[PDB]
Symmetry: C3
Subunit: 266 residues, 3 copies
């Protein structure tokens, strides 16, 4: 759908309309828009004013980028993210990530809301994402499917090192600082397309496959991000324990904000 | 994604409502080899799919397929004789189009039937499996009939499916079958949908078994999802027509009758 | 399916009227296996670009030539390079050649690929005789037989449980043992994933748990279409890497297979 030039035009629009130069892009998942409250010097672009940006036909959720500083670090936030279940093809779901790269961003933080599959997780837990399982990807729904563009990356990029080891260590180490009751969980995120929720038998499948949390987003963006060389890390907020038998948001937002200090300099 | 507007459904509902006097409470979708169930209908009135607005039909004549209104065991109902499959090339919003029409007709209950291959070793050809749950493999990957913008006149953006197969109807079906008298028990288990149309390899069948599927086929799950999305009560059955190979080494009429009997045990609107 | 029956026939007629070669056997050469065309005698080459209705190999290393000739005296035709879903091709394109071959009068299809080893006992350089497959794209809808079935090619619901020919399997095992080699000929299940990005550790564990012995991004669609039209099928993966199954932190073989396929031409039964 999009050409290299389309991404570049969008990026140049943004660059000539703000003096902000973000090092870090952050995608806010459901219930996590509150992260934009922590930016200083906020400049806002509604998705509808940005050339080439996907928008929803559905009213209500407008969708926006907000540029600012988070804990002293220059960043851009996506408030309102695109999902496969809404009907967007994956190249639109992940369009913004390639834009961020052309903006100069070297780090992508991904957040989402997910169903706990690991019995020891509780509602309100934060799961540091260690790895993923791309079920749509197995069957053909991969955002890199089609001709490859070497201005972005390789034809066959590796994903085994997708979730940055350094950020993982610094996150485990930092979370201990925050005097929290429960430890920071860690585990594997599985994407399913949705939009209907999982049956019990489906949840047992996902658990047997080794998944600790399930949701309907994030993975396509991680893949495109890694294709073009961005450092990636992220977190799932566990908003339910899925059924296997027949304030927490504000905490994650504050943790993400503290972690900016740990992102390496450009 | 969805190529139908709300109006399209409504027009198809209006057309039908104005061309029959029947007012079904229950819809029934007849799977392979179960078209005979329309024989048991009293005061039948037939609509060929081809004469119904917006309805899918084959590009291949030889089959038109048909909708039949009537009373089954005294219960007002409508029956799909001939269902659609993903493997024929239909998108899932066409496969499941009838279900939203039924909802607009005033139906509040959907009964689904199919022919499935048995994966549970203790099943036998001719068994009836009461559908307890499903595993939607196409849905995992993106092929879910709710994909696209959600229309709140039908349902929520994110409907639960964990309670999809009505528990009350399950209990009554188990109770009822026991009092009819047959050699073999009413089976119960998880249906797994795969797209087909090719049949499964031994390695694939083993995968399906390890995942906890009891029976496998190529239909039904989409219709159930859409039914639950617009709030219909759902239950259904698989007829085990073969036992799938896991190593490199009359039953229809019985189901038709059992369904007929069970109309009595369906709650009122 | 965007192709009519006539599109297949026209492509076949074009070939039948531009070569006098009449192959019994088609062979699809995977990544790194194009050198198998070297062993043909009396070779006639068509570029895919000059063949009506034919798709293009966009992956470097997949040459994009249809080569007719004799291999160990057997009349065959070789796809030097193949097509993949990850390139952006729908499966009816990926598998277009298989039906052409059928109309050419071919009765045996040989599939080869480069694959990742999921079985711990495999090694880089091993050849795995394909015993069975797991079609993950197929579970979800991506099946080349999707759409109206044409009975001029085959049935609506063809079986795949006997896809990899038992006779050829036995003769392959038997023949390799005569061939004297350090490693024995491996045997196992091939799982197709779409790609193009490589698997995560957790994804490799999934594929192992499903019972797959090797993984790649091709072949299965071709086999399904071949079986649909009744062709005899067998095939091999060259294990080019052992996929990583654990988290780790600091804190010639092609020619062998090529030769072996050449030798096995003499075990293919005649028409």
């Amino acid at each position: 759908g999009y050409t290299y030039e389309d991404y570049k035009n969008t990026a140049e629009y943004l660059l000539s309309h703000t003096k902000h130069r973000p090092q870090v892009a952050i995608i806010c998942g459901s219930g996590l828009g509150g992260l934009t409250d922590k930016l200083t010097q906020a400049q806002i672009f509604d998705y509808s004013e940005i050339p080439n940006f996907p928008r929803s036909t559905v009213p209500g959720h407008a969708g926006r980028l907000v540029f600012g500083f988070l804990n002293g670090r220059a960043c851009v936030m996506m408030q309102g993210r695109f999902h496969m279940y809404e009907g967007y093809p994956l190249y639109k779901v992940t369009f913004p990530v390639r834009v961020f790269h052309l903006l100069g961003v070297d780090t992508l933080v991904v957040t989402n809301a997910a169903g706990g599959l690991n019995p020891k997780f509780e509602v309100g837990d934060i799961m540091l994402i260690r790895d993923h399982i791309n079920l749509p990807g197995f069957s053909g729904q991969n955002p890199l499917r089609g001709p490859n563009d070497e201005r972005f990356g390789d034809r066959f990029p590796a994903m085994s090192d997708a979730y940055d080891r350094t950020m993982r260590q610094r996150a485990l180490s930092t979370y201990k600082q925050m005097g929290e009751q429960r430890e920071l969980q860690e585990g594997t995120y599985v994407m399913v397309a949705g939009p209907s929720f999982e049956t019990v038998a489906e949840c047992r499948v996902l658990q047997k496959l080794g998944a600790d949390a399930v949701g309907m987003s994030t993975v396509p963006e991680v893949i495109v991000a890694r294709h073009c060389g961005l450092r990636v890390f992220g977190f799932s907020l566990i908003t339910n324990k899925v059924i296997m038998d027949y304030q927490a948001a504000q905490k994650l937002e504050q943790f993400v904000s503290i972690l900016m200090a740990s992102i390496p300099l450009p």
